[PDB]
Amino acid sequence: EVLAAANSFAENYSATSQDMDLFQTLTSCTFSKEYAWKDFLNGIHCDV
């Protein structure tokens, strides 16, 4: 039922500027100094 409700809500969801801002808030940087592990691992290379 939760999955069905999620599908029903997402199929009829309209993007909003405030919702975009809050999603970016989630995506944006943090109040604590965090190391960017994603681009570090993406750009890393190991040699034997």
Partner 1 sequence: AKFPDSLSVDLKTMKDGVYRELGLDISLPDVMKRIAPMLYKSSKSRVV
DSSP 43: T
Residue 48 CA to residue 35 CA, distance in Å, equals 26
Q: Is 22 in the site for partner 1 (CB under 8 A)?
A: no
Residue 12 Cα distances to 6, 9, 24, angstroms: 10, 6, 21
Q: Is 48 in the site for partner 1 (CB under 8 A)?
A: no
Pick the binder of partner 1 from 14, 27, 28, 32 (CB under 8 A).
Answer: 14
Pick the binder of partner 1 from 2, 3, 17, 40 (CB under 8 A).
Answer: 17
Residues that bind partner 1 (CB under 8 A): 14-15, 17, 20
